[PDB]
Amino acid sequence: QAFRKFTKSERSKDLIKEAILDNDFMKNLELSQIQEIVDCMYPVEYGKDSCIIKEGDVGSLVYVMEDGKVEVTKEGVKLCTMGPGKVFGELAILYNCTRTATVKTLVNVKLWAIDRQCFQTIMMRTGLIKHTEYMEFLKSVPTFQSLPEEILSKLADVLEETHYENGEYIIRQGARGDTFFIISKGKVNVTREDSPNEDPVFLRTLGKGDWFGEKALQGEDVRTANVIAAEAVTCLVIDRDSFKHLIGGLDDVSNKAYEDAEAKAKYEAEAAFFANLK
Amino acid sequence: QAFRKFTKSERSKDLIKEAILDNDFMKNLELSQIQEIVDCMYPVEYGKDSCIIKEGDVGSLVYVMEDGKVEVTKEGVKLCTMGPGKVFGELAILYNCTRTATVKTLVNVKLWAIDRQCFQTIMMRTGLIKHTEYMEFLKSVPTFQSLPEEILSKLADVLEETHYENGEYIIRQGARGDTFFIISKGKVNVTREDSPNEDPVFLRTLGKGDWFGEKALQGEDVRTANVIAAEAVTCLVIDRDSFKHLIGGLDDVSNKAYEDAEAKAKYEAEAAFFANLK
Ligand SMILES: Nc1ncnc2c1ncn2[C@@H]1O[C@@H]2COP(=O)(O)O[C@H]2[C@H]1O
Ligand SMILES: Nc1ncnc2c1ncn2[C@@H]1O[C@@H]2COP(=O)(O)O[C@H]2[C@H]1O
Fold it and tell me: Could you tell me which residues belong to the region cGMP-binding, low affinity (chains A, B)?
């Protein structure tokens, strides 16, 4: 399914969009999401001296002022007035829907609104978009393309995107590591120092699609070589424990697979029975 | 189940017994079973020359007379009388057919009754009772005591109790067996015909708790030795195909099958990951 779009003027569309990009909470949303919210919102008007949001209320609507002026007050304390181009009523959505302040109108106003559902949903599409971009990325790299679909997709739901600047060491020869890295952007150099005062030896170079620190996923072990960024570098990463988890979460028994075990079992039970006798 | 006890006169309580002991379908019940029957029976004094059961009726009650006389007529043809004893009306309940005869009284009677359900239950209690006995018996033999509870209980639902007499061949060498025997009473001698026209060689004696003929459960076609009862013998018996059917449906076998399956899945998945790197 999908949501009911309310076709509006480009003027209003642009306005709604600026107000969002100007809101502490929503300025982070992905374009696709912002355009969605922009299309979901419908017009709402309130007369002068009308209470729109009352603190304590359990609310669902998020608004965008288009015209008029409102006044925000909390526990009786006037906080500010707001005019066109401002978002309000978005905060309750991340406090279990309990309004944190009162919003009364000073003149007749014209708002653009969206309900809790269209809102909470749209917001939710954040993890989905990530998974997509990640999946898209993983499937562009030969090695990870070959991986079965269950892990590849479950890997994409927990991976974190950490960053590095030219010159920073990502991992060092001799450290107690537990993080696996997949280069999504940049390039790095791997070096290892022979043993004593032997200047660091250059081993290989990795870049987009390459990876390193695999061993950390297979129990406690010290790194065999250093890995330093050789320019701006981005890495999708996952720590050992989280991995062990992902793996121990591959709840995917195949139809025929359960059948074969369904068989293996019977055989054993019978043989086990006769065993117990003589 | 827990039913109601219509406490009658000690005279009457000891009156029904005889009537029950006189029935082909009830002269086998356990002391307890009878006790109950006598207990849930309730007084149903009827009028003189009154009717009770009509051929074609759908049964629901079973009775035993106490102080009356009736005519178990039928096609109008007085097919006999019946005094304060003989149990009647049971036949319809057991075959669930339709009243066969058409009883009618001959004077102010004083018969007793019990509904289709209290009777139905008490009767079938023979099954649960034997299960228990069988269950108890197996648990008192170490080699079967160690078996899981599901197997012992399924086993008690199918095992049959059979008897032989001093000197009888239970198993004859070279025959085709389909049964496995567990000795619950007596002793047996196991001999083996070594070569033709030769004195069968003694192998061993088995007693309460021991067992013989397991091979048959594995499909062995021909028995390799004679098994002669050395005195009165009672055995619990089960046939190959019933055994194999039993085993194959154990819930403790499917649960251990799925787990073994989900564990291979998690393993296979991990190795697939590290096999993909290099
Ligand atoms: N200073 C402020 N304190 C609290 N809420 C404010 C303030 N300025 C604007 N608001 C808005 O007022 C809204 C009242 O309801 P919400 O808690 O849903 O969301 C709140 C914000 O969007
Ligand atoms: N000779 C008889 N033939 C048939 N039923 C009889 C006879 N004598 C007694 N009865 C009882 O009368 C009952 C009539 O109905 P039912 O078939 O339920 O069960 C029958 C027996 O319990």
Answer: 143-263
B276: contact with A, CB 8 A cutoff: yes
Resolution reading in Å: 2.5
Q: Quick one: A142-278 is in which CATH superfamily?
A: Jelly Rolls (2.60.120.10)
Rounded CA gap, B78 and B26, in Å? 26
Asked if the C-beta of B143 comes within 8 angstroms of chain A's C-beta atoms, the answer is yes
Long-range contacts of A251-259 (CB under 8 A, 24+ apart): A251/B262, A252/A150, A252/B265, A253/B258, A253/B261, A253/B262, A253/B265, A254/B265, A257/B261, A257/B264, A257/B265, A258/B257, A258/B258, A258/B261
Beta-bridge partners for A70 = A82, A105
What is chain B's alpha carbon radius of gyration, rounded to the nearest angstrom? 28
Cα gap B71→B109, rounded to integer Å: 12
| Chain-chain contact of A277 with B143 (C-beta, under 8 angstroms) | yes
Cα–Cα distance for residue pair A245/A238, rounded to 1 Å: 11
Binding residues of B for 3',5'-cyclic GMP: 89-92, 99-100, 204, 213-216, 223-224, 258
Which residues numbered 194-213 in B keep a CB inside 8 Å of some CB on A? Answer: 211
Contact in structure between A196 and A204 (CB atoms under 8 Å)? no
Whether residue A151 and residue B254 make contact (CB cut-off 8 A), yes or no, is no
CB distance A52 to ligand 1 below 6 Å: no
Q: Is B70 in the pocket of ligand 2 (CB under 6 A)?
A: no
B119 closest CA partner among B164, B174, B60: B60
CA distances B68 to A6, A103, B64, B81, Å, are 90, 93, 10, 10
Structure tokens at A157: 């739901």
Burial of B52 (0-12, 13-18, 19+ CB in 10 A): buried
CATH of B1-141, one of 3.40.50.720, 3.40.120.10, 2.60.120.10, 3.40.50.1820: 2.60.120.10
As a whole number of angstroms, the distance between CA B52 and CA B67 comes to: 15
Distance CA B235, CA B208 (A): 9
Place of tokens 């991992």: A171
Structural domain boundaries in chain B: 1-141, 142-278
